[PDB]
Coordinates of C-alpha atoms and ligand atoms in Angstrom, one line a residue:
Chain P
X20 CA 70.1 66.1 -17.8
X21 CA 73.5 67.0 -19.1
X22 CA 74.6 70.3 -17.4
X23 CA 77.4 72.7 -16.8
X24 CA 80.4 71.4 -14.9
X25 CA 80.0 73.8 -12.0
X26 CA 76.3 73.5 -11.5
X27 CA 77.3 70.2 -10.1
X28 CA 80.5 71.5 -8.4
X29 CA 79.2 74.8 -7.0
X30 CA 76.7 72.7 -5.2
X31 CA 79.4 70.3 -4.0
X32 CA 81.5 73.3 -3.0
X33 CA 79.0 75.0 -0.7
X34 CA 77.7 71.8 1.0
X35 CA 81.3 70.6 1.1
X36 CA 81.3 67.1 -0.5
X37 CA 83.1 65.4 -3.3
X38 CA 81.9 64.3 -6.8
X39 CA 83.8 61.4 -8.5
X40 CA 85.0 62.2 -11.9
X41 CA 85.0 58.9 -13.7
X42 CA 86.7 58.3 -17.0
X43 CA 85.4 56.1 -19.8
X44 CA 86.7 54.8 -23.1
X45 CA 83.6 52.8 -24.3
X46 CA 80.0 51.8 -23.8
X47 CA 80.8 49.2 -21.1
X48 CA 82.5 51.8 -18.9
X49 CA 79.9 54.5 -19.5
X50 CA 76.9 52.1 -18.8
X51 CA 78.4 50.9 -15.5
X52 CA 79.0 54.4 -14.4
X53 CA 75.5 55.6 -15.1
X54 CA 74.0 52.6 -13.3
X55 CA 76.1 53.4 -10.3
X56 CA 75.0 57.0 -10.3
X57 CA 71.4 55.7 -10.7
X58 CA 71.8 53.2 -7.8
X59 CA 73.4 55.7 -5.4
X60 CA 71.2 58.7 -6.4
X61 CA 74.4 60.6 -7.1
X62 CA 75.4 63.3 -9.5
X63 CA 77.8 62.2 -12.2
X64 CA 80.9 63.8 -13.6
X65 CA 81.8 61.8 -16.8
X66 CA 85.2 62.4 -18.3
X67 CA 87.2 61.4 -21.4
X68 CA 90.9 62.1 -21.9
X69 CA 92.2 63.2 -25.3
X70 CA 93.3 59.6 -25.8
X71 CA 89.8 58.3 -25.0
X72 CA 88.3 60.8 -27.5
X73 CA 90.7 59.8 -30.2
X74 CA 89.9 56.1 -29.6
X75 CA 86.1 56.4 -29.7
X76 CA 85.7 59.6 -31.8
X77 CA 84.3 62.7 -30.2
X78 CA 81.0 62.4 -32.0
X79 CA 80.6 59.0 -30.4
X80 CA 81.7 60.0 -26.9
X81 CA 79.3 62.9 -26.8
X82 CA 76.7 60.8 -28.6
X83 CA 76.8 57.9 -26.2
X84 CA 76.5 60.2 -23.1
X85 CA 73.5 62.0 -24.5
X86 CA 71.8 58.7 -25.0
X87 CA 72.6 57.7 -21.4
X88 CA 71.2 61.0 -20.3
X89 CA 67.8 60.3 -22.0
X90 CA 67.8 56.9 -20.2
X91 CA 68.3 58.5 -16.8
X92 CA 66.9 62.0 -17.3
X93 CA 67.0 62.6 -13.6
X94 CA 70.7 62.4 -12.9
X95 CA 72.8 65.6 -13.2
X96 CA 75.7 64.8 -15.5
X97 CA 78.6 66.9 -16.6
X98 CA 80.7 65.8 -19.6
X99 CA 84.3 66.8 -19.0
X100 CA 87.4 66.9 -21.1
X101 CA 90.2 65.5 -19.0
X102 CA 93.7 66.9 -19.5
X103 CA 93.1 69.1 -22.5
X104 CA 96.5 69.8 -24.0
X105 CA 95.8 72.8 -26.3
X106 CA 93.3 75.5 -26.9
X107 CA 92.1 73.9 -30.1
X108 CA 91.4 70.6 -28.2
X109 CA 89.3 72.4 -25.6
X110 CA 87.6 74.2 -28.4
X111 CA 86.7 71.0 -30.3
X112 CA 85.3 69.6 -27.1
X113 CA 83.2 72.7 -26.6
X114 CA 81.8 72.5 -30.1
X115 CA 81.1 68.8 -29.8
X116 CA 78.9 69.4 -26.7
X117 CA 81.1 69.0 -23.6
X118 CA 80.0 71.0 -20.7
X119 CA 83.3 71.1 -18.9
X120 CA 86.9 71.2 -20.1
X121 CA 90.3 71.0 -18.4
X122 CA 93.2 72.9 -19.9
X123 CA 96.3 71.4 -18.5
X124 CA 99.3 73.8 -18.9
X125 CA 100.8 73.0 -15.5
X126 CA 104.1 72.1 -17.1
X127 CA 104.4 75.7 -18.3
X128 CA 105.7 78.6 -16.2
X129 CA 103.0 80.4 -14.2
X130 CA 102.6 83.1 -16.8
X131 CA 102.2 80.8 -19.8
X132 CA 99.8 78.6 -17.8
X133 CA 97.7 81.7 -16.9
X134 CA 97.9 83.0 -20.4
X135 CA 96.6 79.8 -22.1
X136 CA 94.1 79.0 -19.3
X137 CA 92.7 82.5 -19.7
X138 CA 92.3 82.1 -23.5
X139 CA 90.4 78.9 -22.8
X140 CA 88.2 80.3 -20.1
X141 CA 87.1 83.1 -22.5
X142 CA 85.9 80.9 -25.4
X143 CA 84.6 78.3 -22.9
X144 CA 82.6 80.7 -20.8
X145 CA 81.3 82.4 -23.9
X146 CA 79.7 79.1 -24.9
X147 CA 78.3 78.2 -21.5
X148 CA 81.0 75.8 -20.5
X149 CA 83.0 75.6 -17.3
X150 CA 86.8 75.2 -17.2
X151 CA 89.4 73.5 -15.1
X152 CA 93.1 74.3 -14.9
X153 CA 96.1 73.0 -12.9
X154 CA 98.8 74.5 -10.8
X155 CA 101.9 72.6 -9.7
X156 CA 102.6 69.2 -11.2
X157 CA 101.6 65.6 -10.4
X158 CA 104.3 63.9 -8.4
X159 CA 104.6 63.6 -4.7
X160 CA 106.8 64.5 -1.7
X161 CA 106.1 70.5 -7.9
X162 CA 103.5 71.2 -5.2
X163 CA 101.1 74.1 -5.8
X164 CA 101.7 77.5 -4.1
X165 CA 98.6 79.1 -2.5
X166 CA 99.4 82.7 -3.2
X167 CA 99.9 82.2 -6.9
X168 CA 96.7 80.1 -7.0
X169 CA 94.9 83.0 -5.4
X170 CA 96.3 85.2 -8.2
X171 CA 96.1 82.5 -10.9
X172 CA 92.4 82.0 -10.1
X173 CA 91.4 85.6 -10.0
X174 CA 93.2 86.6 -13.2
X175 CA 92.0 83.7 -15.3
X176 CA 88.4 83.6 -13.9
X177 CA 88.6 79.8 -13.9
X178 CA 85.7 77.8 -12.5
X179 CA 87.7 75.0 -10.7
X180 CA 91.4 74.4 -10.0
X181 CA 93.5 71.3 -9.6
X182 CA 96.2 72.1 -7.0
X183 CA 99.0 69.5 -6.8
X184 CA 99.3 68.4 -3.2
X185 CA 101.2 65.1 -3.7
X186 CA 99.1 62.7 -5.9
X187 CA 100.1 61.3 -9.3
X188 CA 98.3 59.3 -11.9
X189 CA 98.4 55.5 -12.1
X190 CA 98.6 52.5 -9.8
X191 CA 101.9 53.5 -8.2
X192 CA 101.3 56.9 -6.4
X193 CA 103.4 56.6 -3.2
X194 CA 106.8 55.0 -2.8
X195 CA 106.9 56.2 0.8
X196 CA 104.1 56.6 3.4
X197 CA 101.0 58.2 1.8
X198 CA 101.7 62.0 2.2
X199 CA 99.4 64.7 1.1
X200 CA 99.8 68.4 2.1
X201 CA 96.4 69.1 3.6
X202 CA 97.5 72.5 5.0
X203 CA 98.5 73.5 1.5
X204 CA 95.0 72.3 0.3
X205 CA 93.3 74.4 3.0
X206 CA 95.3 77.6 2.3
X207 CA 94.4 77.2 -1.4
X208 CA 90.7 76.5 -0.7
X209 CA 90.7 79.5 1.7
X210 CA 92.4 81.9 -0.7
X211 CA 90.5 80.9 -3.9
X212 CA 87.1 79.9 -2.5
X213 CA 86.2 77.7 -5.6
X214 CA 85.7 74.0 -6.2
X215 CA 89.1 72.2 -6.0
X216 CA 90.0 69.1 -8.1
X217 CA 92.0 66.1 -7.0
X218 CA 93.9 64.3 -9.8
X219 CA 95.5 60.9 -9.4
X220 CA 92.8 60.0 -6.8
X221 CA 92.4 56.3 -7.3
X222 CA 92.4 54.4 -4.1
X223 CA 93.3 50.8 -5.3
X224 CA 91.0 49.0 -2.8
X225 CA 92.2 45.7 -1.4
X226 CA 89.3 43.8 -3.0
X227 CA 90.0 45.4 -6.4
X228 CA 93.6 44.5 -6.2
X229 CA 92.9 41.0 -4.8
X230 CA 90.4 40.5 -7.7
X231 CA 93.1 41.5 -10.2
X232 CA 95.8 39.4 -8.6
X233 CA 93.5 36.3 -8.3
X234 CA 93.0 36.6 -12.1
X235 CA 96.7 36.5 -13.0
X236 CA 97.4 40.2 -13.0
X237 CA 100.6 41.8 -11.8
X238 CA 100.4 44.9 -9.5
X239 CA 103.6 44.7 -7.5
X240 CA 104.2 48.0 -5.6
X241 CA 100.9 49.5 -6.4
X242 CA 99.4 52.1 -4.0
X243 CA 96.6 54.5 -4.4
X244 CA 95.2 57.2 -2.1
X245 CA 93.8 55.7 1.1
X246 CA 90.1 56.1 1.7
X247 CA 91.0 58.2 4.7
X248 CA 93.1 60.6 2.6
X249 CA 90.3 60.7 0.1
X250 CA 87.9 61.7 3.0
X251 CA 90.3 64.2 4.5
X252 CA 90.8 65.7 1.0
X253 CA 87.1 66.5 0.8
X254 CA 87.2 68.1 4.3
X255 CA 90.0 70.2 2.9
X256 CA 87.7 71.4 0.1
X257 CA 88.4 69.0 -2.8
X258 CA 85.1 68.8 -4.7
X259 CA 86.0 66.8 -7.8
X260 CA 87.9 63.5 -7.4
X261 CA 89.4 62.1 -10.6
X262 CA 89.1 58.3 -10.7
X263 CA 90.2 56.1 -13.6
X264 CA 92.8 53.4 -12.7
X265 CA 90.4 51.9 -10.2
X266 CA 87.8 51.3 -12.8
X267 CA 90.2 49.8 -15.3
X268 CA 91.7 47.4 -12.8
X269 CA 88.3 46.2 -11.6
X270 CA 87.1 45.8 -15.2
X271 CA 90.1 44.0 -16.6
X272 CA 90.1 41.8 -13.5
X273 CA 86.9 40.2 -14.5
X274 CA 88.0 39.9 -18.2
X275 CA 91.2 38.2 -17.1
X276 CA 89.1 35.9 -14.8
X277 CA 86.6 34.8 -17.4
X278 CA 89.4 34.3 -20.0
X279 CA 91.1 32.1 -17.4
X280 CA 88.3 29.9 -16.2
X281 CA 86.8 29.1 -19.6
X282 CA 89.0 28.7 -22.7
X283 CA 86.0 28.1 -25.0
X284 CA 84.5 31.4 -24.0
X285 CA 84.3 34.0 -26.7
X286 CA 80.8 35.5 -26.2
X287 CA 81.8 39.2 -25.5
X288 CA 78.8 39.7 -23.2
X289 CA 80.2 36.9 -20.9
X290 CA 83.4 38.9 -20.6
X291 CA 81.9 42.4 -20.1
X292 CA 78.9 41.7 -17.9
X293 CA 80.9 40.8 -14.8
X294 CA 83.4 43.5 -15.7
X295 CA 80.6 46.1 -15.8
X296 CA 79.4 44.9 -12.4
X297 CA 82.8 45.1 -10.8
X298 CA 83.3 48.7 -12.1
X299 CA 79.9 49.8 -11.1
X300 CA 80.5 48.6 -7.5
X301 CA 83.8 50.5 -7.4
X302 CA 81.9 53.6 -8.5
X303 CA 79.0 53.1 -6.1
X304 CA 81.4 52.7 -3.1
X305 CA 83.4 55.7 -4.2
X306 CA 80.2 57.8 -4.4
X307 CA 79.3 57.0 -0.8
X308 CA 82.9 57.6 0.4
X309 CA 83.1 61.0 -1.1
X310 CA 79.6 62.1 0.0
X311 CA 77.9 62.1 -3.5
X312 CA 75.4 59.5 -2.8
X313 CA 71.8 60.7 -2.3
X314 CA 72.6 64.2 -3.5
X315 CA 70.3 64.0 -6.4
Chain Z
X1 CA 73.0 56.5 -44.2
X2 CA 70.3 54.1 -42.8
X3 CA 68.3 52.6 -45.6
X4 CA 65.7 49.8 -46.1
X5 CA 67.1 46.3 -45.9
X6 CA 65.9 45.3 -49.3
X7 CA 67.2 48.4 -51.0
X8 CA 70.6 46.9 -50.3
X9 CA 69.4 43.4 -50.7
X10 CA 67.4 43.8 -53.9
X11 CA 70.5 45.3 -55.6
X12 CA 72.4 42.2 -54.3
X13 CA 69.6 40.0 -55.6
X14 CA 69.7 41.2 -59.3
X15 CA 73.4 41.8 -59.6
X16 CA 74.0 38.3 -58.1
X17 CA 76.2 38.9 -55.0
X18 CA 76.2 38.4 -51.2
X19 CA 76.2 41.1 -48.6
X20 CA 77.6 40.2 -45.2
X21 CA 75.3 40.8 -42.3
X22 CA 77.5 41.3 -39.2
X23 CA 76.4 41.0 -35.6
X24 CA 77.5 43.5 -32.9
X25 CA 77.2 43.8 -29.2
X26 CA 79.0 47.1 -28.5
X27 CA 81.0 50.0 -29.8
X28 CA 84.2 48.1 -30.6
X29 CA 82.4 45.7 -33.0
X30 CA 80.3 48.4 -34.5
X31 CA 83.4 50.5 -35.3
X32 CA 85.4 47.6 -36.8
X33 CA 82.5 46.7 -39.1
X34 CA 82.0 50.2 -40.4
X35 CA 85.8 50.8 -41.1
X36 CA 85.8 47.5 -43.0
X37 CA 82.8 48.7 -44.9
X38 CA 84.6 52.0 -45.6
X39 CA 87.9 50.3 -46.6
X40 CA 86.3 47.9 -49.1
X41 CA 83.6 50.3 -50.3
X42 CA 80.9 47.8 -49.4
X43 CA 77.2 48.3 -48.4
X44 CA 76.7 47.3 -44.7
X45 CA 74.1 45.1 -43.1
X46 CA 74.4 45.6 -39.3
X47 CA 72.6 43.2 -37.0
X48 CA 71.7 42.8 -33.3
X49 CA 70.1 39.8 -31.7
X50 CA 67.4 40.2 -29.1
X51 CA 70.2 39.4 -26.6
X52 CA 72.6 42.1 -27.8
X53 CA 69.8 44.6 -27.8
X54 CA 69.0 43.8 -24.2
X55 CA 72.7 44.0 -23.3
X56 CA 73.1 47.5 -24.8
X57 CA 69.6 48.8 -24.8
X58 CA 67.7 49.4 -28.0
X59 CA 68.1 53.1 -27.6
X60 CA 71.9 52.7 -27.6
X61 CA 72.0 50.1 -30.4
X62 CA 70.2 52.5 -32.7
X63 CA 72.0 55.5 -31.3
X64 CA 75.6 54.4 -32.1
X65 CA 74.5 53.2 -35.6
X66 CA 73.1 56.6 -36.3
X67 CA 76.4 58.2 -35.2
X68 CA 78.4 55.8 -37.3
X69 CA 76.2 56.6 -40.3
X70 CA 76.9 60.3 -40.0
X71 CA 80.5 59.4 -39.8
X72 CA 80.4 57.5 -43.1
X73 CA 77.5 59.0 -44.9
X74 CA 78.5 57.4 -48.2
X75 CA 78.0 53.8 -47.0
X76 CA 74.5 52.3 -47.4
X77 CA 73.6 50.7 -44.0
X78 CA 70.6 48.6 -43.0
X79 CA 70.0 48.0 -39.3
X80 CA 68.3 44.6 -38.8
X81 CA 66.8 42.8 -35.9
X82 CA 68.3 39.3 -35.8
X83 CA 66.1 36.5 -34.6
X84 CA 63.2 38.6 -33.4
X85 CA 61.1 36.0 -31.5
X86 CA 57.8 37.9 -31.1
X87 CA 55.6 40.3 -32.9
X88 CA 56.2 42.6 -29.9
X89 CA 60.0 42.4 -30.3
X90 CA 59.8 43.2 -34.0
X91 CA 57.5 46.1 -33.3
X92 CA 59.8 47.7 -30.7
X93 CA 62.6 47.4 -33.2
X94 CA 60.5 49.2 -35.9
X95 CA 59.6 52.0 -33.5
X96 CA 63.2 52.4 -32.3
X97 CA 64.4 52.9 -35.9
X98 CA 65.5 49.6 -37.3
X99 CA 65.2 49.4 -41.1
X100 CA 64.9 45.6 -41.1
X101 CA 63.6 42.9 -38.8
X102 CA 63.7 39.1 -38.7
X103 CA 60.7 37.3 -37.4
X104 CA 61.9 33.8 -36.6
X105 CA 59.0 31.4 -36.1
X106 CA 60.7 28.6 -38.0
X107 CA 60.2 26.3 -35.0
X108 CA 56.5 26.5 -35.5
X109 CA 54.5 24.7 -38.1
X110 CA 54.1 26.2 -41.6
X111 CA 50.6 27.8 -40.9
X112 CA 51.7 29.3 -37.5
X113 CA 54.8 30.7 -39.2
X114 CA 53.0 32.2 -42.1
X115 CA 50.3 33.7 -39.7
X116 CA 52.8 35.4 -37.4
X117 CA 55.2 36.4 -40.3
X118 CA 52.4 38.1 -42.2
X119 CA 51.4 39.9 -39.1
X120 CA 54.9 41.2 -38.7
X121 CA 55.1 42.0 -42.4
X122 CA 51.9 44.1 -42.4
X123 CA 53.1 46.4 -39.6
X124 CA 56.7 46.4 -40.8
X125 CA 55.8 47.4 -44.4
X126 CA 53.4 49.9 -42.9
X127 CA 56.4 51.6 -41.3
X128 CA 58.5 51.1 -44.5
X129 CA 60.6 48.4 -42.9
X130 CA 61.6 45.1 -44.6
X131 CA 61.1 41.7 -43.1
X132 CA 63.0 38.4 -43.0
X133 CA 61.5 35.0 -42.1
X134 CA 62.8 31.5 -41.8
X135 CA 61.8 28.1 -43.2
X136 CA 63.1 24.8 -42.0
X137 CA 65.2 24.4 -38.9
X138 CA 68.9 25.0 -38.7
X139 CA 70.9 21.9 -37.8
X140 CA 73.9 20.1 -39.3
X141 CA 73.3 17.9 -42.4
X142 CA 65.6 21.5 -44.3
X143 CA 63.4 23.8 -46.3
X144 CA 60.7 22.6 -48.7
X145 CA 60.9 24.6 -51.9
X146 CA 57.2 24.5 -52.9
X147 CA 55.9 25.7 -49.6
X148 CA 58.6 28.4 -49.6
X149 CA 56.9 29.6 -52.8
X150 CA 53.6 29.6 -51.0
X151 CA 55.1 31.0 -47.8
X152 CA 56.6 33.9 -49.6
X153 CA 53.6 34.5 -51.9
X154 CA 51.1 34.5 -49.0
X155 CA 53.3 36.5 -46.6
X156 CA 54.7 39.1 -48.9
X157 CA 57.9 38.9 -46.9
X158 CA 61.0 40.6 -48.5
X159 CA 63.6 37.9 -48.0
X160 CA 63.8 34.4 -46.6
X161 CA 66.2 32.3 -44.7
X162 CA 66.0 28.7 -46.2
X163 CA 67.7 26.0 -44.1
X164 CA 70.1 23.9 -46.1
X165 CA 72.5 22.4 -43.5
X166 CA 74.0 25.4 -41.6
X167 CA 73.8 25.9 -37.9
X168 CA 74.9 28.6 -35.5
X169 CA 78.2 28.1 -33.6
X170 CA 81.8 27.2 -34.1
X171 CA 80.7 23.6 -34.6
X172 CA 78.4 23.4 -37.7
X173 CA 79.4 20.0 -39.1
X174 CA 80.2 16.7 -37.4
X175 CA 82.2 15.7 -40.4
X176 CA 82.5 17.1 -43.9
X177 CA 80.5 20.2 -44.5
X178 CA 77.5 19.6 -46.8
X179 CA 74.8 21.9 -48.1
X180 CA 71.9 21.3 -50.4
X181 CA 72.4 23.8 -53.2
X182 CA 69.7 22.1 -55.3
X183 CA 67.1 23.0 -52.6
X184 CA 68.6 26.6 -52.7
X185 CA 68.4 27.1 -56.4
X186 CA 64.9 25.7 -56.5
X187 CA 63.9 27.9 -53.7
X188 CA 65.5 30.9 -55.3
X189 CA 63.7 30.0 -58.6
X190 CA 60.3 29.5 -57.0
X191 CA 60.5 32.7 -54.8
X192 CA 62.5 35.2 -56.8
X193 CA 63.5 37.3 -53.7
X194 CA 66.7 37.8 -51.7
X195 CA 67.7 34.7 -49.8
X196 CA 69.4 34.6 -46.4
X197 CA 72.1 32.2 -45.1
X198 CA 72.3 31.8 -41.4
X199 CA 75.1 30.1 -39.5
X200 CA 77.5 31.2 -42.2
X201 CA 80.7 31.8 -40.3
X202 CA 83.8 30.2 -42.0
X203 CA 86.1 29.9 -39.0
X204 CA 89.2 30.8 -41.2
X205 CA 92.4 28.9 -40.3
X206 CA 94.2 32.2 -39.3
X207 CA 91.4 33.2 -37.0
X208 CA 91.4 29.7 -35.4
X209 CA 95.2 29.7 -35.3
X210 CA 95.1 33.1 -33.5
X211 CA 92.6 31.9 -31.0
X212 CA 94.4 28.7 -30.2
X213 CA 97.7 30.5 -30.0
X214 CA 96.1 32.7 -27.3
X215 CA 95.2 29.6 -25.3
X216 CA 91.7 29.3 -26.6
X217 CA 89.8 26.1 -27.0
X218 CA 88.0 25.3 -30.2
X219 CA 88.1 21.5 -30.0
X220 CA 86.2 20.2 -33.1
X221 CA 85.1 23.5 -34.5
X222 CA 84.2 23.8 -38.1
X223 CA 82.3 26.4 -40.1
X224 CA 81.2 26.9 -43.7
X225 CA 84.3 26.7 -46.0
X226 CA 84.9 29.8 -48.2
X227 CA 84.2 27.5 -51.2
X228 CA 80.6 26.7 -50.0
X229 CA 80.0 30.4 -49.0
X230 CA 80.9 31.2 -52.6
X231 CA 78.6 28.5 -54.0
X232 CA 75.8 29.7 -51.8
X233 CA 76.0 33.1 -53.5
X234 CA 75.8 31.4 -56.9
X235 CA 72.8 29.6 -55.6
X236 CA 71.1 32.9 -54.8
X237 CA 72.0 33.7 -51.2
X238 CA 72.2 37.5 -50.9
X239 CA 72.7 38.0 -47.2
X240 CA 75.2 36.1 -45.2
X241 CA 74.9 36.2 -41.4
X242 CA 78.2 36.3 -39.7
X243 CA 78.8 36.6 -35.9
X244 CA 80.9 33.7 -34.6
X245 CA 84.0 34.6 -36.8
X246 CA 83.9 38.1 -35.4
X247 CA 83.8 37.1 -31.7
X248 CA 86.6 34.5 -32.1
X249 CA 88.8 36.9 -34.0
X250 CA 88.1 39.7 -31.4
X251 CA 88.4 37.6 -28.3
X252 CA 91.6 35.9 -29.5
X253 CA 93.4 39.3 -29.4
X254 CA 91.9 40.1 -26.0
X255 CA 93.2 36.7 -24.7
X256 CA 96.6 37.4 -26.2
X257 CA 97.1 40.8 -24.7
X258 CA 96.1 39.4 -21.3
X259 CA 98.7 36.6 -21.7
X260 CA 101.3 38.9 -23.2
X261 CA 101.3 41.5 -20.4
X262 CA 100.0 40.8 -16.9
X263 CA 100.3 44.4 -15.7
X264 CA 98.3 45.7 -18.6
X265 CA 94.9 47.2 -17.7
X266 CA 94.4 49.9 -20.3
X267 CA 91.2 48.9 -22.1
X268 CA 92.3 50.4 -25.4
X269 CA 95.4 48.2 -25.3
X270 CA 93.0 45.2 -25.3
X271 CA 90.5 46.4 -27.8
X272 CA 92.5 48.2 -30.5
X273 CA 94.1 44.9 -31.6
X274 CA 90.8 43.1 -31.3
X275 CA 89.0 45.7 -33.4
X276 CA 91.8 45.4 -36.0
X277 CA 91.4 41.6 -36.2
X278 CA 87.6 41.9 -36.5
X279 CA 87.9 44.5 -39.2
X280 CA 90.1 42.2 -41.2
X281 CA 87.8 39.3 -40.8
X282 CA 85.0 41.5 -42.2
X283 CA 87.0 43.0 -45.1
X284 CA 88.0 39.5 -46.4
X285 CA 84.5 38.3 -46.1
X286 CA 83.2 41.3 -48.0
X287 CA 85.6 40.5 -50.8
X288 CA 84.7 36.8 -50.7
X289 CA 80.9 37.4 -51.1
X290 CA 81.4 40.2 -53.6
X291 CA 79.9 43.2 -51.7
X292 CA 83.3 44.9 -52.3
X293 CA 83.3 48.0 -54.5
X294 CA 79.5 47.9 -54.7
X295 CA 79.0 51.4 -53.1
Ligands
CA429 CA1 99.7 68.1 -15.6
CA430 CA1 65.4 29.1 -36.0
NA431 NA1 90.2 66.7 -15.1
NA432 NA1 68.7 37.5 -39.6
ZN433 ZN1 94.6 63.7 -14.2
ZN434 ZN1 70.9 33.2 -37.2

C-alpha cells in the first residue's frame, strides 16, 4: 500500500497529528520499522538519504520496501527521498518508484531555492509524486521567515515545507536550553496552510542513551528534542517528524552489547535480532507520542 | 539470472571444478557475495538455511536475490534451500521461487531417507527445481558408497552430500584434519553426479587473525585446510558450502569498528568494512575452487 507522500500528510494536516519519518539503510532497519507500524496501527513514512541509496542501491531500497508493502498491505506507506541535493537526484528517485522527494536547496538564496524547488515540483507532480523543500537552515538559536515561506510555498506549489525553527541533525542538537521558536512555527503554519516537516527531530530518550552507554558507547554532550517539544511542535502544525539518530543509537546499542557479552558470538542474527527489537520499540513509542498510532 | 542448480552444477561436474555455495542472512551478505561473483567472473550458488529464511522471510529472501540478479544479469545464480528439514519446507521454497532445495533427512535410516528424498524430488523436478540430499552424518573423523549408488539411482536426486569427516562450525577437527577421499572418489564413480561438501569453511589465518585482533574468541577453532578443499574438488566435489568463514570475516570488522570508535553509530560505517572482508573471503574461495572465470 505504497502511496503518495501527502495522502498520508494531508490527512495528518487536517486532523492535526504527526507522522514519524524513519530512515533506513538496510533490511534490519526496514523490517523493525514496518513491524512497529503494524503493531501501532500507524501510517509509515519510510525515508532514505542519498547516502543510504548509494549504499544499498536505489533498485534495492525501492525493491525491499515494495516487498514489505506486500507483507503488510494494509499500512499506508510513503517512500521518501531525504535531502535530495539536485534535480537529477530527485528525478532518479521519481523514476525508481519513490512517492515523495525532498529537494534541499536551503543553503541557496531564496530565489535559487525557489527556482530549483519549482523545477523539481513540476517533474515530480507530473509523475504523481509529492515534494518537500526547506527554508532557513538547520542550526539553532538561519531561522525561517514566515512571509517568504508564504511566498515560497505559493510560487513553487510545493506539497510540504521544512521550516527551520531551531533543530539540527545528529545527537548534539542543543548546547543551551532546548529552544524552538513555536511562534515562528505557528505563523508559517498559518500563512502557508500545508503540512510542515521537522528535521533533526530525534529525542535521544534516556533509556536509549542509557542502553548505548551501558554497552560501551560514548555520547557525552548529546541532546535531542524533548518529547514535550516534539508534542508542542505537532500542536504548532508539524506533520512530518524526521527521525534517524534515535534508531541508529538504539540499534548499535544492542550490537555493542552482544559483542561485549559474548566474544565467541558471530551469528549475525544474534546481533541484529535484539537490535531490531530495540529500534522497533523506539519507533512504536514515537508513533504514540506524535499521534500516529491507531490512525490506520 | 536465476537458473536451475544443476545447470551450474552439471557444468562444474564435467569440467571438474567446485562452485562455492555461500550462505546469507541479509542484504549485506547478499551484496558482498554478488560483487565477489562479479569481480571473479564466477557462477554463484546462493543459499539460505531454514533459520535465515525465517529471519528475513522467504518473500524477502527471494526478493533481494531477484533484485541482485537484475543488477548483474550476466552471472548465473542458483538460489538453494539449505538443510530443508521437511517436505513442506522444500515445497514452500519451490513455490517462492528457489531453483534448488536440500532435503536433509540424513539423520534417518537409509529407507526413510530415500522415501522422503524421492517425494521431494518428484515435486521439485515437477516444478523444474533441482534437489540435494545427504548420506551419512556430519561429524569429525560416514557415507557408504554402494548404497549411495542405490540411493541416487532410486531417488533420481540431482546431487548428493556424502559425509567424509566434515562438520559445521568453527571447530571441525579435534586434532589434524582428515577426510576420506577414497570414499569420495568411489561415491563419485558409483553415482556420476555432482557431489556436495558441507562443513567446508577453511577458517583462513587472516580471517582468524582479524577476528582475534578485534577481541573475538575462537579458542580451538579449525576448518578444512585449503589443501583439502582442493583435494575434495579433485575427488569430485562440485559444490562447497561456506557460511562460517563469511560470518567470522564479517563480524570481525563489526567488532573492530565498535572497539575503534565508541561514538560511532552510523550503520554503514560498521557494514561497509564488513562487506568488504566478506567479499574478499568469497573471491579467494572462488579462485581456490576454480569457479573463477567460468562465466
Ligand atoms: Ca539543509
Ligand atoms: Ca545432517
Ligand atoms: Na526529509
Ligand atoms: Na546444502
Ligand atoms: Zn534532515
Ligand atoms: Zn550444511
